[PDB]
Structure 1
Amino acid sequence: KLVRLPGLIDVHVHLREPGGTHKEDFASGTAAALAGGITMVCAMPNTRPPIIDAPALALAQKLAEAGARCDFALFLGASSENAGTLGTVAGSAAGLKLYLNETLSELRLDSVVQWMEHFETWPSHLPIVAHAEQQTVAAVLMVAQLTQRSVHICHVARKEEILLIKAAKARGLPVTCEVAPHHLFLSHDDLERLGPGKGEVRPELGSRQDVEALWENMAVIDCFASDHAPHTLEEKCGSRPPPGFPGLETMLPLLLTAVSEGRLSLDDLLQRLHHNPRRIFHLPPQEDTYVEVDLEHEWTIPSHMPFSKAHWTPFEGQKVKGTVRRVVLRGEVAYIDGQVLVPPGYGQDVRKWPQGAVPQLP
């Protein structure tokens, strides 16, 4: 007997197009999403060229409309030069992404004053998300308070960070956060097996105590999101390993395993992969869209999942219980039992739907 879930939303994916299409492209990354029970993705802007201006967003929108198999929204990226220039296109994006730690030269911000400038100029009704680790979480929260608005913290990975966010929420501050599956299901204990190249990710894998703190503080976690960050095995195993794990195809099976073990409820999962993504990012419903999962099927994660061009996975060897059997997207069968059945270009930019515009005062 299958369980029907609504269309799940991953608010943090790197689909690598334009400019890194050997790692992933819209077509392969959204095939991976559908196979993971995800029907809508928000794609990050650290592409080549990065999505830091209107022409780059226009290009990315067309590449996504032509290649995506599930629905999507595209983030804009903050740069040292673009504060105050994005107002005409801001509402067409998923939100604004700030990279506040290590990143591409083009997305590097060298001063907290540049963070303030973005918080002051980006339209106040639209989402801002930040890659902000350790004390950077507290720093960006301060900027958000100085500018009197909300912030969403990407991939919280540490006891330190979740407790800081917990304390901020206890003070009524408008902050939300997400956690990625690798920070719930992998730790330092796995670095021996992964090795130093494959194991490179940012935020880095935490201690057992970090992992346990995230689980204990599930109530503080608003969303799950994969931070699907595909790189090829050659890259991960080479001399300058880029950080990141692929994760679209493994996220939901890992979390369904946890549900089956009573570590969180089905509702807890659906708040974090459906309702809270919708409400934080003002993402629209998808009509006639659902995911059918089999919660009894036990399997072992293989050395690579079928669809991501990353062609490797750090979860290899983990035993999971739960599998995606069928996905229906806007009335069409999109995935059954290992076969994607919608072509590149079936997916649409949800920010162009009437119901996908973020409401604002006139």
Structure 2
Amino acid sequence: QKLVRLPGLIDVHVHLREPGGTHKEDFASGTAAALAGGITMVCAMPNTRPPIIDAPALALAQKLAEAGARCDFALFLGASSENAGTLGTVAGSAAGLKLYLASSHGVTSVVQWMEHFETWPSHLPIVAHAEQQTVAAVLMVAQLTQRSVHICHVARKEEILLIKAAKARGLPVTCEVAPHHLFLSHDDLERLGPGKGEVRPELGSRQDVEALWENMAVIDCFASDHAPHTLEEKCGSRPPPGFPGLETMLPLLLTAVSEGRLSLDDLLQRLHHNPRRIFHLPPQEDTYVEVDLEHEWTIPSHMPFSKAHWTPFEGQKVKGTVRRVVLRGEVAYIDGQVLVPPGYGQDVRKWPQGAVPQLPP
């Protein structure tokens, strides 16, 4: 068929596990998974080992990413029980601040949330892992401190309808939804098993999944929440939560597009334009993705690149394939082969156009 050209897509929620969890994934394998999924820019979460909750850990993570990343990236800082008010000099160099309100870096009191909202620079992003009533609680803190907040992986009818009500009142809140909460449900827990199927937020009911689709207008971004764990860990005694998702996100969503569940533009708003404008991420010159919307295939037991080496979407039929990715003028991916080496990717916050504009302080 004739290929469809897309801009370089952005995933604002990936866990690349480097430093400290490199058997699950590292920058080189995670960004290869990204490129294979049509993603040319990722925002990596801070719950690594050591966690990115201070300047030295950020300095280390930056060098590991610059040395191992194959696509471009930005790095989140994590809010901790100790670092409120201490991140002012490095905050602008990060993708944003992740507030983990379920990895929590010791944050346990709403008063600590307030301190972070008061001290983190007001022009820079804050994203929150907040489930069920926690969405309401963190929105309240955002209002008290009169600033915006971005809600990670919305998974429930309860949560999306709450955000819907907040937007109707004109509040500055945006949100993202991950593909497993659009394409998997309780109906899949029998096949997956209790170990494999462990994820946070957990899989929703059919009614939850139906509510997210019905309220697509409320969803600002799609993001994978790529959370790689080995099969041994997912099936073991204390299964960690999370799915790998970089290599399956776009095929799943392209399938929905070909079925008329959302438009191609609807998809590009949520994987390109809205991530750009929420996180102030720069364009990528000479960067685009070529996909084939006619190719039907079945998702295998594991995708080629993620070290997780498993996938909960196994056996699902998809229509849509990433055929070629060009990143800043170089062929990065073609028909299953990655052609840019570790270290090709760059930190977008170091580009002149990647700094977040602010009033002169």
TM range (shorter): over 0.9
Matched-pair contact (CA < 8 Å) for 1:16–1:23: yes
Matched, 1:249 2:247: yes
Matched-pair contact (CA < 8 Å) for 2:32–2:70: yes
1:312 to partner: Cα distance? 0.0
Write out per-residue CA displacement over residues 245-285 of structure 1, whole angstroms, 9 at most, x where no aligned residue. Answer: 00000000000000000000000000000000000000000
C-alpha distance in structure 2 between counterparts of 1:89 and 1:82, whole Å: 12
CA RMSD of aligned residues (A): 0.7
C-alpha distance in structure 2 between counterparts of 1:322 and 1:110, whole Å: 43
Write out per-residue CA displacement over residues 217-270 of structure 1, whole angstroms, 9 at most, x where no aligned residue. Answer: 000000000000000000000000000000000000000000000000000000
Extract structure 1 runs of 4+ deviating beyond 3 A: none
Matched-pair contact (CA < 8 Å) for 1:254–1:320: yes
Show structure 2 runs of 5+ residues with no match: none
Pick closer, same or farther for the CA change 1:112–1:168 going to 2, 3 Å: same
Question: Which residue does 2:55 correspond to in 1?
Answer: 54
C-alpha distance in structure 1 between counterparts of 2:204 and 2:280, whole Å: 31
C-alpha distance in structure 2 between counterparts of 1:58 and 1:203, whole Å: 30
C-alpha distance in structure 2 between counterparts of 1:133 and 1:111, whole Å: 15
1:110 to partner: Cα distance? 1.3
Write out per-residue CA displacement over residues 74-127 of structure 1, whole angstroms, 9 at most, x where no aligned residue. Answer: 000000000000000000000000000xxx966131100000000000000000
C-alpha distance in structure 2 between counterparts of 1:22 and 1:229, whole Å: 13
Q: Say which SS state the counterpart of residue 31 (structure 1) adopts.
A: helix
Aligned residues: 359
C-alpha distance in structure 1 between counterparts of 2:251 and 2:145, whole Å: 40
Matched, 1:69 2:76: no
Matched-pair contact (CA < 8 Å) for 2:47–2:103: no
| Superposition TM-score, scaled by structure 1 size | 0.99
C-alpha distance in structure 1 between counterparts of 2:279 and 2:179, whole Å: 20
Matched-pair contact (CA < 8 Å) for 2:74–2:347: yes
Matched-pair contact (CA < 8 Å) for 1:50–1:106: no
Match of 2:211 among 210, 213, 216: 213
Write out per-residue CA displacement over residues 319-345 of structure 1, whole angstroms, 9 at most, x where no aligned residue. Answer: 000000000000000000000000000
Q: How does 1:40-51 map to 2 (within 5 A)?
A: 40-51=41-52
Matched-pair contact (CA < 8 Å) for 1:40–1:72: yes
105-114 or 66-75: which moved more? 105-114
Matched-pair contact (CA < 8 Å) for 2:77–2:95: yes
| Superposition TM-score, scaled by structure 2 size | 0.99
Matched-pair contact (CA < 8 Å) for 1:138–1:164: yes
Aligned-residue sequence identity (percent) comes to 98
C-alpha distance in structure 1 between counterparts of 2:158 and 2:106, whole Å: 24
